[model samples]
Target chain A: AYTTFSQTKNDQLKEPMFFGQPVNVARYDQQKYDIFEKLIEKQLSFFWRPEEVDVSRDRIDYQALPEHEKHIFISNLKYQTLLESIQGRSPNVALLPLISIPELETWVETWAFSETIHSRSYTHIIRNIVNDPSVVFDDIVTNEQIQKRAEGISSYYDELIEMTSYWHLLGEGTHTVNGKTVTVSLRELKKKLYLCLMSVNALEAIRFYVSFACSFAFAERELMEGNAKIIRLIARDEALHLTGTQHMLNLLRSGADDPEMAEIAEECKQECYDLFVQAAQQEKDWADYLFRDGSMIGLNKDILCQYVEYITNIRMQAVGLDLPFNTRSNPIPWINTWLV
Target chain B: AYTTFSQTKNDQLKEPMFFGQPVNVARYDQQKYDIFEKLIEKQLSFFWRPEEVDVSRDRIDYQALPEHEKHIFISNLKYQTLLESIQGRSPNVALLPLISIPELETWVETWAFSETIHSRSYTHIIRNIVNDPSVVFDDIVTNEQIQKRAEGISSYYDELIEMTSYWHLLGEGTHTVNGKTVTVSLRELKKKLYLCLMSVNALEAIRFYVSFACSFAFAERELMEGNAKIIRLIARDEALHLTGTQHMLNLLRSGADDPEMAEIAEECKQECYDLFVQAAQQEKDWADYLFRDGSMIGLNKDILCQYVEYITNIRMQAVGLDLPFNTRSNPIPWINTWLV
Candidate 1:
């Protein structure tokens, strides 16, 4: 019985961010949590188009690269495309149906739309750099390395979306679906949502940064500067995106948004910690795959792995999870220049 | 059954717009339908913020209005707020789960995000003109006239969403749900989707234009030029949006996208015609409500009703539906000055 526009007028300021009621009026004059409104404004101000960037020099720069460097660069671009492809639509598909407040609802849509811009930028970069963009785009589905990453990344969203469909259809109870007993509970749904947000935060926070490191590694040597310029804009937007997810996680865990969510966060702390650790490990494995043939001059498996651990610890700490990796300094401090 | 990113490697060019492989790679290098790509580009290029417009003088103009004119202006704004409130979230929630092509998927997201911008503009206009914006926004749900409109508009989306959930969860079969028999069929679901799009088309194609006439009607006499400026931009975006839906419906009915959808379009033709006619009648009834107290200088119930019939005929022909009303010239010829 989820209506697109709930007809009953209630106090929008009193509703929880996710599950109180579907947002009826998209009013910005007041908000229960103003951070989402701020994020919407910041994101709108950061509006950009990939076509606006000039990538002609990237073709020449790409042609001159060593074969192993080409492997590193193209594989990294394929992975970025995969990440954005999921990020672009998953948030809206998985999250929009459940959101109850106008500010957060609009923020989710705005956040997802920005990722489409990121998705388009990859095509811009790929088409400019390669003779056949299909070869690269096609490999995203067939490549085992990238598919492994996609499985782990998409599993959380897939699980959440399925559970949401069930909950919305059958409501909270154990139901027989296809001869199997499936349980749907509001508490369980909230936990799935929390973990999903954690996964998404890791995506925007950790996985994207790892790829940004690879993209910037070439720019450090004054190569593929045009691609770097687009990534720079994407990186700036990802910063806002990561902040948006981080705040959502922090606010939910703090019990400021939904009191029941605090309990679920407490119960799922270890799972959340394991999820973050697993994502970090996946990045390290990806580093191995990226450098299997040979390493670029400025980056190697060891250096990239260290950067993974370094950023992993930082992001884990921000979301109140225990540090899984040993404390370390920034392995690639130069990334800051491009991120801002 | 549904994943945010499907794992299978398939030709995106061969996939249908919805209910295909869920668009794994967000590639823009090519498209199954380039109209969607064109729409995405047009929407992105048309992006503007509400705060960019200066609406300060509107407060004075609003203050000078007769009570009946005040009634027309604020009620129109509330109905607008209601329309955008549903639109801002419904497309992504109801459509994104089923979208299979990247270009169309991104267009849906982009389209929904633009509606959020429209929702914000209502707040901008309301805050500038009224001492308390809450009175206007709050009445949107409680007002009997607006709630009736909300019911008809949200029903298509609500029915589609519910069926979508059942289809995604239980997936195309007769099943016992909570001891009651419920059936889900892809064909039936497609019919629902077809009618939903028809309803949405009427919303964008016909109903929104009705409200725009009211907004622009006040500007005809230079009464609320600030609101008019914002409405002009919104109308420009709506033209793109209505075009997007029109192409989707036309392509589906032409048997060029999905042959099965073309069959569904044929099966649902009369329903589509009635849906459009019903929307027109609702708009005409709303006209009666708008001018119940008194008439404005350049617009009134009869004139608005005439324009509703006039535009309904044009829009009906655009999608190959039989016109339910007589064709005539544009009643509010001056409104075109603000639309472009």
Candidate 2:
């Protein structure tokens, strides 16, 4: 049972990672993990609304771009729309019920809400860049490349969600439903969670980085600077988000938050390693598709792929995963100039 | 199963109220109902942070109040803290998994997030007025009057959540677990939802109005006007929130969204009427307790009780519930002066 405010006798600041007791009060005076507190402060400082940034000039810039460059630009924007659309709601829906502490619960909602702001910004940007925003929003579902990536992302989340639903509903059971015997276990749920976090880390670390490079490439040449500015703000927020995932992964790996989670992390180490590799490879393939027709001035397929390997290694090392692809050098060093 | 972004091929705007299909896209171009969109706009327009309101003068005001008057102020603040505390997370935690539309899902999260801001405001207010913030926060669970109210509010949400977990875990079934038969049904869940919304409506309508009267009464005498100013902003947001509930109730009653919800509303009509009446009685009792030492200039127990009846009837009619009280006159018309 959940309360608007938990009135339980237990103190929430001492609660475990998940499923101990629902938080009774929204007090920030204490926290078991200060990373969430840090994330909240960082997120609040990064507060922005879409209307603040003026994307008015993008209308003309979008129109004047050559056909292939237009494809690169618009496709990248649509893909970003897809990523945020999932992110805006997923963390709250999937993560909130399982969270036991007050700060962590609020942090999950705040994190997801900021993503919705990002999702809304895309709408604002797309509405300014094109006469028909519907065309862009519609292509998000209909475009083959975007749809393919959506499947990969949604599959992992779906698996985790199903297992969670089963756990919440049945509470660890071997039951026959619809003539199929199914066993639901906490260990299985934790494994799904570990992989889901890795997939999310891959998303923030590699996929969005690839998209960020495309956005900043325009700013490198002094084009669509307003859009680039908004993306930079988003990148800053994503840095905190990436940091949050890193803390969660490291905490679980170190057996600090949950002992089961640590064991699950160790058992699924190879799978976690392989998931990042697969995501990096898929992002590289996406890079190929993004620049298949013609390359932009500063960015192309090979360079983007190299950037993917570079980012993948950094993110993997952060989570104690062995690096699969070795690209020590940044493919586009100018990208760093825009990042900071 | 939930996805961060469900890529299921279904028109989001056309889906049923809940459990039809998962929302695939987060497009806001169109909405099945416009109330949520309006709520979002109103809430965003009413955006505020506690730091934006200066409560420094409140410390001085606290020093001047009589001992019992000080008790009234701090106790009322504590009760408000518990109310917003529950509200901050209940909507998102209880409602998100069941939402079928993208706009509605985002609205639930946004609404809950705003409540969190309100929760923070209470802490800010308490920290300013009192020397020890922990004293007030910790006493919220221990105070008898506030604890009674907390139970009423938390029980409704808790029931819905437990039933929701059951439905999600086991689907519709009659199963024996640990030698006890449990029946999980959608009809039962919808009834729980209707009752829960009614309970929430009563909290917003009757209880909050009672609190507002107390806060404004202090300002009527030029005492704690700054605190009154902040409460006025909170009142404005509460007006929107209560209106949001009224819209949801009316839509359910009119069979505009869910046909089953209409039946549930009809079946729960008597319970809804009783909930409001009980809350009004509770507020009247609270008024007596608040003014036990002495009455303020423009407000007293009798007048506050009358205001509770007046506001309760208005709120009842707004949601299609028959009025259960005859107190129609506004006893504290001056309260509206501060509110407006």
Candidate 3:
């Protein structure tokens, strides 16, 4: 069983980023890799509240929308809402126990906290957009298309977490569960973790960016300026979050933290590449649904699909995965306007 | 066995604050208890970074301190690091899995994230003061006086977490573990959770304030002004955190969210009162160590101990506990100048 606070005194600077010893004393006086500590500082510096931005004006803008436009607006938010909901909780639950250094451990929590803030920002947008917010929220889980997207995203996290329970309980061995033999291999678990990180990176790098483009699509037309301002802050925060997972994956692959993790990364390169393509395709399909009723002016299924291909290649290249999409400039150049 | 995002389509607004059902969707548009949602909003608005506070003067100030004063200052910081070290990690690891409402679940992560930032602030303060920051951090876990106190403070969190693993694994029934039949009762777990909250309230309310007095006393003397500035920010964030637990205990006991919890709170009363008294005494013993080299100009063992008594009673009474210490007045009013 994991203790909340480990009792052993540790040199946090000496521990690898993960799977060394659980961080015993949370301190930041010095760091083995100061980049994570630096990330923490920047995240805190960027702290913001959803309430700080008044979405009141957007309520009127949302009410002015045609039926298809309302469908596009609320559906985009429901997807954003679902993604933030998972990102807010996943890092702390799945990553906190395994982190061995104080900086990375704190980074995970800081990253998750900011996502929770982003989730709150979505709630602000939703409440202002509709009289009954439940109509928007319920569709996130019950809508056939949204549920399909939710399943693929949560599947990787669920895989790692399920095996982790067995790993933590049974401790890297063969065990009997419900009269069936279950094998828990540390190497297999490390690969699962590496792939999960890659999936999250793509989700942050591509999936969230895909959603932001939709949120920003409305902003380009001088509509929902209030919602744009909040998403602007939320997107800026997401920039920090995207950098965080990028660092974690890069650090693990470079073998500076753990050599086995490097091996695991090497072994799973093609697997994660496939995962990246899968997220892109799903996101492209999401774009199709958003535009199902009708396409917004600045964004449409074809342009959004091009953006997906454009983003997938860049993120895949970052993780040492072979490029899986044709190289192209950002399809939506105006996206730079809303993002920090 | 625990998934990051529960896929059930349930009313997030109907769940209790904890353990009613795992929050399926992260939505803040509706809430069973708005206080946690409100706390999340309040905490996000108060975000800060430690680097923003320049403790550069403290390096010079520390070189100027009398050995006894240096002893008091360093010892005080070592304790702060220890507490933040635990608080920074405990809530996420122990509480996140069990939180059942979206607001409270998100609050626990936000609350935890701020504590990690507070831990970073300690590193800034310690690195400025000492040639080797490790000297302070390493001693936090190994020091006899500190470890003695660490045990009492961590025991509550440790117990709750240990039982939680069993409960989540076996889930409210009798089971054989390593040849012994152990019953995992959800009621017992709830009782543990209630007392744990009370102990945490005391830790945050009483123990933290006692440490702040020592930090601010040096600031009152025009010493370590920069370090005091950082601690001031930490204390202010902590003021919000203190309110979080207080609201939780109050809500649970009033039977507003979980009626069974009211009975749980009532049953845990004596254990909680004794727990409060125990924490107060530990704070008193910590006073003995802070001034062991010699008492500082504005603060000493007796005065700090008296403040402990005064604050302990007030904090205990806030959560409806019997006053653990004699009613007394503030022994160091000058310390208030630094608090928000």
Candidate 4:
């Protein structure tokens, strides 16, 4: 049985990553990966409660918006809710059981807890902006654009989870079920995990960046600075999250954790490339849908699409993926002003 | 595939607990179990940071203590470190993947994250009280009293973890490995979980309370109030944690989540009773060890042992366990003064 703090046995924790003996003690005296600790420190330092930010003014601002702008605002809010809803629980659900080190385990929980707060913030933001918050929340699942993207994102996690369940339930081997033989191997499981992390990185590094640009674009035109302030706080936390996933992907690809994972990374490089491009294209499609009826002041479908590609390139490079998309300057540069 | 948040499909989530389809959305509008939501609210209300408590005065308090008293103080601190250290990560590591509901999943992470802060507080307290914090922390694993309890407490979690791994990796079947057959079943896994929760409840309800009585006893004499303040916060959080485990046990016993769990609870009732009684007896023994040199003015071995019995009975009843101990009433009512 693994204690939260394992009794210190003299072994180098730096050897291999992911699946080893479960981490025993939560110690920072030494670390196999300092990036996780850095992420934790950065997360702690950036901590703020949703109550600390006053979004009271946004209630009035939201009421004054044009019909189409209201659609833009509420739809974005719904999507944000969806993003955090999955985020608040996914990392812990998907990652914790596989974690073999103490610091990384704490980091995973810390990271997920922060997302719950972000999820809570969406409710707080929506309650202030919309008269009937339930109406907006209810539509998130039904909305065609958001629902389609949700499926794509959840599919990776679902596959990983299914394989994980099978692997955990039945160790790696050939098993016959209903007269069909299924082969399960650790390497196959690690590939799913590596791909899952890649998908998560795309979610954090690209998808979130696209949403942040939209949120900040509104603030640039002085629409909802209070909401922007909250998003900025979320953005700061997301930066750490983005860095975290980047580190995981980089670690796995570099063979720092498992040499087999390095091979899997090379083998799956095209798959990783496809995942990023698909998500970026989806985000671009979402931008089209967001602006189909009308456009917000500083952001339109074309600019949002440009930002998606630009951000996707940066994210791809971070994971050691070659620049598969053309590197373009951020289309909505004004959003940076709100970010800073 | 799970998005950070997927669109909620009411039909899918209606499946049985554990091994159900992955939870898509985090909605509290409904729950498979309301107890988890209540636990979440109670835990959130108990939010605190270790930095809020000042332990700078603990250093001065340490300097004035007699040699034996110093041993009592530091040894207790070391033991507290070991408890929180294990608690900080184990619940999330062990429980998260198996949780079928969104609220319970997030609650597990929040609960465990709070424990990490508690673990961090130990480092904060130790760093302040001693010249070299490592000296105290280093001895925790080697210290016979601490190691003895660690072994007992960790064995329960370890057994559950191993069983879970086998259940996850091997599924429910008979598998022959190295010419030996191993049978894995969900019923057996549920029993392991029930007993594990009982073990955890004992740790929080009995073991930690015993330690708290000692910590508060120091403050009763107007010494180490700073450390006492931190312990008070820890106690407040522990109250919620104990309440959580109690609810989990009661829910299972009531056949609220899974009927198999209820059966397991019934089957393990005697074993659970033995576990709590044994933990209380161990705490009493630890109290004797603490006071072996001499007793303090407000606390002693005999009185502390009585408190352990009193707490054990109360905790046992909270989780629907028949009270096995006769001790009633607080032996040191004034200890509550230091607690608040």
Question: lDDT of each model, Cα atoms only?
Answer: 0.89, 0.79, 0.82, 0.77
Greater-DockQ candidate between 2 and 3: 3
The alpha-carbon lDDT assigned to residue B106 of candidate 1 equals 92
lDDT of 1 by residue, A30-103 (tens): 89889999999999999998999999999999999999999999999999999998889989988888898888
Deviation in angstroms for B39 in model 3? Answer: 2.3
> Candidate 2 residues B85-164, lDDT tens each?
78878887777777787777777778888877777778778778777777777888778877888988898888887787
**Candidate 3 or 1, higher DockQ:** 1
Model 2: clashing residue pairs? Answer: A4-B86, A5-B86, A6-A24, A169-B169
Error of 2 at B38 (Å): 2.9
User: Per-residue alpha-carbon lDDT of model 2 for A59-172, expressed as tens digits?
Assistant: 888788888988898899899888998888778767776778877877887888888878878877887888777778777878788776545777777677777766765677
Best by lDDT: 1
Report the lDDT tens digits of candidate 3 across residue range A291-326.
Answer: 888787888999999988988888878777888777
Backbone clash tally for model 1?
A: 0
**Count of clashing pairs, candidate 4:** 22
**Candidate 2's error at A30, in angstroms?**
2.9
CAPRI accuracy category, model 2: acceptable
DockQ scores of the candidates: 0.81, 0.48, 0.56, 0.37
Order of models, best DockQ first: 1, 3, 2, 4
Model 4 docking tier (incorrect/acceptable/medium/high): acceptable
The DockQ of predicted model 1 stands at 0.81
> Lowest-lDDT window of 10 residues in candidate 4 chain A?
A1-10
- B144-175, model 3: which lDDT tens digit per residue? 88877656667677678767767776688777
TM-score of each: 0.98, 0.93, 0.94, 0.87
